[PDB]
Amino acid sequence: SGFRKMAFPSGKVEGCMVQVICGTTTLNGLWLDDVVYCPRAVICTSEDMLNPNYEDLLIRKSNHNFLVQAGNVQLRVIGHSMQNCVLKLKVDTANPKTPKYKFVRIQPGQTFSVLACYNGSPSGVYQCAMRPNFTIKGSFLNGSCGSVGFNIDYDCVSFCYMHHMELPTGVHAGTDLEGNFYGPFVDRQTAQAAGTDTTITVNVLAWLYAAVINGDRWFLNRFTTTLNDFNLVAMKYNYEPLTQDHVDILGPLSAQTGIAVLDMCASLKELLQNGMNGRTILGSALLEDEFTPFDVVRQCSG
């Protein structure tokens, strides 16, 4: 029993983290085989950052301008190239700790584990969801740029996020490992704001099933609703529409608990319209939307 925000074990990724220094700018890189991937922001100085022309900045660099340190071992850079908002630094040594890996791009509503790092050294691990507005609510300080997000499946690490920046609201933005930003953001120190965000309805329902599996049942009712009538309510509360595919994905949790998906929707409708009236669900006084159906199944009894 129990339900916690749980990250994947980080060791496979820890063995891949390095420090990249260009001039006085330092950040983290990801060393897989004979390539180190890092944010192209490493080539900017403080003043370059308002309006950097990265192609210009890069053509003025050579391999020797990049110092890559893996623990107490300096790696010699023997080539460099830019791919979108990441740099690929070819090094003379293949990382002996490279795990099986993929570069995947995730969807809004999906979760992943973040290994926060500073100076190439891992400092903490936590779970994040990609919000509907393509930001993440992380915990990152200066020096964290280049920290990565990932999921693990059967010892294959699927890297999905590289951290770049913090927006004025305190949320975070970054790229996939091909260097393409999630969302309408750019790697420069300008006023940028995310679109209005929405609540991930299917994940709230998944977490309500986790709660039932864990013995929290007070929010259940003998009522039901239609999908159409539910979405009419969800729209008023700034929840994403719930699709038939979402209903299907919740099938296994519905089967395990005996609570039809549309019945749980009726419970959520009542929670939205009434609030919690002083009670908690799985230790929270708010409706939690950062657990996917997979996260619930992975963690909850069968």
Partner: peptide, 10 residues
């Protein structure tokens, strides 16, 4: 306020 590229200084 502007976005911040969260690199470090050294």
């Amino acid at each position: 306020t502007s976005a911040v590229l969260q690199s470090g200084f050294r």
